[PDB]
Symmetry: D3
C-alpha cells in the first residue's frame, strides 16, 4: 500500500537483541489545527504492528504545522496526531537545495527520535 | 586520518537547525579486562572534536568486551573507557549472515544512541 | 505455562493509546556469574511477543546476584541476562516481614522500570 | 483530607532502599484554556509534600484539556499547571467499558510516569 | 553568566564553559514577542548561539524570538512551562520564573539549575 | 557544599537545597573499600542521606561503602565511570574525578555538574 522509507533497529524480541524494521512513508494532510488538515502537504513515517500504525515523524516544506490527519485502523474513521515544533534541515535535489522541516509526534521518546534522525541522515542526500 | 562511516544530524548552530555530521571509524583495542586491551579487535565510531575524538560506540565480532583503551590523541579523560553490554545484530555478508556486537560507550544519551542505530540500520546491509 | 503477575500499560498500537498487558512470572536460576546460575532462586517478570520472551526484572531473597539464566525461544538453548544492582524492599507475609531484592535487567528504560515498580507496589502487600 | 489512590515505591531514605508511598486523589478543575478551569472535571493523583501537594497526573472523561488550576494549598509555583496530551485507555465499568483520558503533568520524568501507569494498571479493572 | 561543565573533547573529560546572556523578546504567543522582557542564557557555538533557558519576571511566556544570527532554524522557539524561584536581593526577595527551551535534555536542564543555585543568592 | 534547586513542594516551584559532603571509602571492588579516599555529596532525607556523587583523586573506583545510618538498602553502591576535571588551586592545577552513583537520573547529574562548575575554580 505504501513504500518503505527509513530502516531502523528496534530492541527485541529478546533482551539485548536488535531487529531491523523498515518504517514506511505515506502522504498525509497536516495543518495548524485539526480542521486545517485538508490537502496532502506532508510525508509521515510510521511503523506497522498487528493493532495498526504508529506514526513517528512528519516531513514537510511548511514550518507552521501542529496537527496531522491519518486514516484509522481498517478504514474505521480518522485519527489526529499532535506535532512537536519542527527542526529545519536542507536536502540536495536535482532542482537545488530544498529546505525541509522535520516534526516529531508528541510523545515520541528520544531513542526513537534519534533513530529517525540517523536513518534520515544516512538515507537522504543532505546539503 | 580515518574514513567517514555514519551520517547523523546534530542540532545547531542555533535552536531548531539540524546540521549534517559524518561520524568516522577507526580500529581500536577492547577487552574483557583493562589489561586485555592489546590488539585491535573492534571498530570505533566517533565524532571529531577540537583536540580529540568523542567515541560513541564500538562494533566487534567478539562478545564479553567491557573496556576499551583509546589512543592518547583521542583526549580521553580516563585511561580506560567502559562499555555497555552489547546489542546483537545480524549483517548480510557475501558469505551469508554474520553476527555482530554493538557496544555503546557508557553514558551515551538516548538521542545519540538512537542516531547511531538509525544510521547503522540505513547504512549497512542487514537482516 | 507460567502465571500472570504484574499488569502494565504499554503505549500502542496507535499513538497516545494505552494497552493493558499482564507480565508473566517464572522461577529462574540467578547467580554471581553465568556458571553460578544453577538452582532456581529468583522470580523473573517478562513480556511475551511473537519472537519470544523479554525479561524486565527479577525478584530474589538474595542480594549478590549479577546474572540470570533463561531458556531460549522454543527450547533452542540457554540465554544469560545481566542484572543491575538491586534495590531492597520489604513485603508483608504470613510469616512476618520478608526482605526482597528487585533487580532490573541491564538496558531497561526508566519508563518500564517505573511500570514494574508501580505495578509491584499496587499488587504485593508491602510492609 | 483526601483518599489514598495509587501505591508506588520511591527510593530512599538512602541509596538502594525502596519505600512505599500512597499517592492520593482529589477532584480538580481542568480546561482547554486557563479561563475554562472552573468546575471540577478531573481526578488529580498527587504526592503529599511538606507544605503542599505535587500532582503527577489527571484522569478525566474529557478530551482536549490543556491546563489545570490547582488550589492555593497545593503550593504550585504558577497559577496554571500545563498538561501533556492525554493517553487513552479503557476501564471495565459495571455498565460496560468506559474510555478515560490520562494527562500527565508536563515535565514529569519517565520513572514517575511509569510508576503511575503500572500502579493504575494493577489497581483499576481494565481492558 | 552561568558556568557549566560540558563533556569533551574526549570521552570522560569535562571542560568548563560560561553560558552568556542576551535580552530576549518573549510572549504568550509568537505575535506577542514584541519587546524585550526576558534574559536568554546561551552557549556559543561555531556559527551561532544555542539558547538553553530564559529568566523573566513574567510567568505566562510560551514563545521566544531569537536573532537569525544565532544560526537558528526558525525565528521562534517554544518554551517549557516555567518554574518559580525566589532570589534574595538587598531590595528584598524577588520572584523570578525559569523557562527551559522546549526539548532541552535533562542533563542540560540540570546544569542550568545547579549553576543558578550556586551563582545566585536564593531562598 | 554544593547548592542545587529541587522542584517542590508544589508543582513548578523550586526550593534551594545544600548538598553536604562526607568522607567515603571507595574502591575498585567492594572488598577494597577499606580507607577513606573520596568525598561523597549527599542530600539529607527524612531518615537518612541519599548520595549523588563522589569526588576523588583516583580514577579507578567502582564501588563505595556508605553508612547504614544513611537509610541505605545495601552497604555498597556502585559508581558510574568517572569524568576528569581540573581545578585551579593556588598550589597549581589539580586533577579530580567525578563519579555519579549508578542510575542517578540525568537532571540530578546535571545539577551536580552545574553547581560544581559555579562553585569551584575550574579550568
Ligand atoms: C521499549 N519497547 C517496549 O516497551 C515494548 C513492549 N512491547 C514491545 C516493545 N518494544 C519493541 C520496545 O522497544
Ligand atoms: C519492556 N519491553 C518489552 O516487553 C519488549 C518486547 N519486545 C521488545 C521489548 N522491549 C524493548 C521492552 O523494553
Ligand atoms: C545535547 N548537546 C549539547 O549539549 C551540546 C553542547 N555543545 C554542542 C552540543 N550538541 C550538539 C548537543 O547535542
Ligand atoms: C546545551 N546545548 C548546546 O549548548 C548546543 C550547541 N549546539 C547544539 C546544542 N544543544 C542541542 C544543547 O542542548
Ligand atoms: C517504545 N516502544 C517501541 O519503540 C516499539 C516498537 N514496536 C513496538 C513498540 N512498543 C510497544 C513500544 O513501547
Ligand atoms: C516507535 N514506536 C512504535 O513503532 C510502536 C508500535 N507500537 C507501539 C509503538 N511505540 C510506543 C513507539 O514508540
Ligand atoms: C529523583 N528523586 C529526587 O531527586 C529526590 C529529591 N528528594 C527526594 C527525591 N526522590 C524521591 C526522587 O526520586
Ligand atoms: C538526588 N536524589 C535525592 O536527593 C533523593 C532523596 N531520596 C531519594 C532520592 N533520589 C532518588 C535522588 O536522585
Ligand atoms: C550531548 N552532546 C552532543 O551530542 C555533542 C555533539 N557535539 C558536541 C556535543 N556535546 C558537547 C554534547 O554534550
Ligand atoms: C555524541 N557526542 C559527541 O559527539 C560529542 C562531542 N563532544 C562531546 C560529545 N558528547 C558528549 C556526545 O555525546
Ligand atoms: C523526581 N523527584 C521525585 O520523584 C520525588 C518524590 N518525592 C520528592 C521528590 N523530588 C524532590 C524529586 O525531585
Ligand atoms: C513524583 N514527584 C513527587 O512526588 C514530588 C514531591 N516533591 C517534588 C516531587 N517531584 C519533582 C516529582 O516528580
Amino acid at each position: 500500500h505504501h513504500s518503505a522509507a527509513l530502516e531502523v533497529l528496534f530492541q527485541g524480541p529478546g533482551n539485548n537483541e536488535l531487529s531491523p524494521v523498515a518504517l514506511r512513508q505515506m502522504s498525509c494532510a497536516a495543518g495548524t489545527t485539526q480542521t486545517a488538515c485538508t490537502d496532502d502537504n506532508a510525508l509521515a513515517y510510521y511503523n506497522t504492528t498487528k493493532g495498526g500504525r504508529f506514526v513517528l515523524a512528519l516531513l514537510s516544506d511548511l514550518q507552521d504545522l501542529k496537527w496531522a490527519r491519518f486514516p484509522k485502523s481498517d478504514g474505521t474513521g480518522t485519527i489526529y496526531t499532535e506535532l512537536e515544533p519542527p527542526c529545519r534541515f536542507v536536502t540536495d535535489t536535482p532542482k537545488g537545495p530544498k529546505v525541509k522541516y522535520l516534526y516529531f509526534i508528541k510523545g515520541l521518546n528520544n531513542l526513537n527520535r534519534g533513530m529517525v534522525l540517523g536513518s534520515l541522515a544516512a538515507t537522504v542526500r543532505l546539503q
